[PDB]
Design a protein around this ligand. Structure first.
Ligand SMILES: CC(=O)N[C@@H]1[C@@H](O)[C@H](O)[C@@H](CO)O[C@H]1O
Ligand SMILES: *[C@@H]1O[C@H](CO)[C@@H](O)[C@H](O)[C@H]1NC(C)=O
Lengths: 17, 125, 49, 107
């Protein structure tokens, strides 16, 4: 029931998912 | 498929003998042939192998130099020339054919046996 | 790292390690011969790489 | 030379038992055993080839397994006619050799 994993106003952040 | 062996008997130590294995029931000329011996009451001991065409011949450690294997694809007969016989060479000798049962041909295997012939190296009368 | 781990767990508690996001050199495993049995059923070891 | 050692050299068991015969090679030959059944006074009969393939006409109870250096011959349920001497045999390279033999007797 679990699987893989990955690790790694003055300003505007825009993200397209 | 039949393998008829012959050439056995009593031999004095140090003399020579030729064993024969007549092949039938299959295309002989395409298969390797093996000799396997069994000392009385003892285990199996591989003896000699010959390629299908007789160009390649390998022998076991105990018989290098003394034993010569030969082939006659015309008569479909296998021969084993044994020389410089000694007491330890007494054994029931089998001729044997390579064979491979199915498609796992990367197994190259062992198969049907002759009936085996007894060779006795003895100075007894 | 999996093969060379100092201690493996007991057979009842078989540790399951997940492998992803890496390039696997199966051939280096294949060429190494210290492993007594390198049995394969699913895929021929040559094609593994 | 590739040396094949069988263990045990002999064992006693009764009909219906599960038996295990092991053959270990001095070097990995990786699929190249051949298992034979030999009776006294007659030539051996092939049982398992490539150490895991059952030869035609041999009962399904006979089974071989393994690769590399550790190999096993197994008979699931013994019958009276299965009491005999069994030899492993490599074909990886020449000279071809045999195991020393494993005798199965009645308990
Ligand atoms: C896809 C794969 O690996 N198949 C293998 C085959 O290559 C091998 O010859 C056989 C052994 O009998 O086991 C299975
Ligand atoms: C985990 O997944 C399986 C899928 O068959 C499901 O049956 C099980 O209930 C799941 N576990 C939990 C805690 O939901």
């Amino acid at each position: 029931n679990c699987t893989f994993e990955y690790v790694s106003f003055k300003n505007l952040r825009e993200f397209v998912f | 498929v039949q393998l008829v062996e012959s050439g056995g008997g009593v031999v004095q130590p140090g003399r020579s003998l030729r064993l024969s294995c007549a092949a039938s029931g299959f295309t002989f000329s395409i298969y390797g042939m093996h000799w396997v011996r069994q000392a009385p009451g003892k285990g199996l001991e591989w003896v000699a192998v010959i390629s299908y065409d007789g160009s390649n011949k390998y022998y076991a450690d105990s018989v290098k130099g003394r034993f010569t294997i030969s082939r006659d694809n015309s008569k479909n007969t296998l021969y084993l020339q044994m020389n410089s016989l000694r007491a330890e060479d007494t054994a029931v000798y089998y001729c044997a054919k390579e064979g491979r049962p199915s498609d796992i041909v990367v197994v190259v295997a062992f198969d049907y046996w002759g009936q085996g012939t007894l060779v006795t190296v003895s100075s007894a009368s | 790292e999996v093969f060379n781990a100092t201690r493996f767990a007991s057979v009842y508690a078989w540790n399951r390690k997940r492998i992803s996001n890496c390039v696997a050199d199966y051939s280096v495993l294949y060429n190494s011969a210290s492993f007594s049995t390198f049995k394969c059923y699913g895929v021929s070891p040559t094609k593994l790489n | 030379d590739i040396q094949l050692t069988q263990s045990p050299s002999s064992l006693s068991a009764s009909v219906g038992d599960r038996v295990t015969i092991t053959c270990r090679a001095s070097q990995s030959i990786s699929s190249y055993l051949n298992w034979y059944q030999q009776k006294p006074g007659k030539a051996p009969k092939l049982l398992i080839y490539a150490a895991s393939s059952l030869q035609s006409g041999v009962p399904s109870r006979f089974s071989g397994s393994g690769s590399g250096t550790d190999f096993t011959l197994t008979i699931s349920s013994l019958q009276p006619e299965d009491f005999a001497t069994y030899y492993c045999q490599q074909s990886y390279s020449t000279p071809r050799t045999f195991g020393q033999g494993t005798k199965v007797e009645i308990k």
